[PDB]
Amino acid sequence: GEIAQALKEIAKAAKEIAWALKEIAQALKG
Amino acid sequence: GEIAQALKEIAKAAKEIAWALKEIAQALKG
Amino acid sequence: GEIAQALKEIAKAAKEIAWALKEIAQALKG
Amino acid sequence: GEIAQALKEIAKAAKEIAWALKEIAQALKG
Amino acid sequence: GEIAQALKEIAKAAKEIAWALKEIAQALKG
Amino acid sequence: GEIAQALKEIAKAAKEIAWALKEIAQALKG
């Protein structure tokens, strides 16, 4: 299960990276 | 299957990350 | 299949993320 | 083997990238 | 084939993302 | 083969992206 588990952990982190960048864009737009 | 579902979620997050960074670039350009 | 299609979409978004970050670096240098 | 090892290293780096971007978001919000 | 080609394109974009983020860190440290 | 080599290059670039983002976070926090 190691390859499937590593891909699921990359997908969880990718979602959190997208959300943090939406918050950064909003802060910079005022 | 789990590999395809994780890769589809990474592709959706990658498109959201690209859009947020294009908004950040435009804010910093004025 | 869906695995190859998701990886082609991640490659296309990665190139857009690289371009936006090069524009952010130039804006922060003036 | 080598695919699994490289994916485990990408997952660990992705979690640190997410954490750093949450810190950047919080800094700009406050 | 197309899976190896997409991963090679992701590798090149990742290197360009790392270059740009190092430029951004240096500009903010100025 | 070529799949493992591309993933090893992605892992190395991801570690440098994490480092650069921690530098950015520290600079912004002062």
Numbering used by the authors:
A (entry chain D), B (entry chain E), C (entry chain F), D (entry chain C), E (entry chain A), F (entry chain B): 1 to 30
Q: What does the original paper state about this entry?
A:
αHBs are oligomers of 5 or more α-helical peptides that assemble into coiled-coil structures with central solvent-accessible channels. We targeted two properties of αHBs: oligomeric state, which directly affects the internal diameter of the channel; and the identities of channel-facing residues, which fine tune this dimension and introduce different chemistries. The αHBs are loaded with an environment sensitive dye (in this case, 1,6-diphenyl-1,3,5-hexatriene, DPH) that binds within the channels and fluoresces. Accordingly, challenging the array with analytes leads to differential displacement of the dye across the array to give a fluorescent fingerprint.
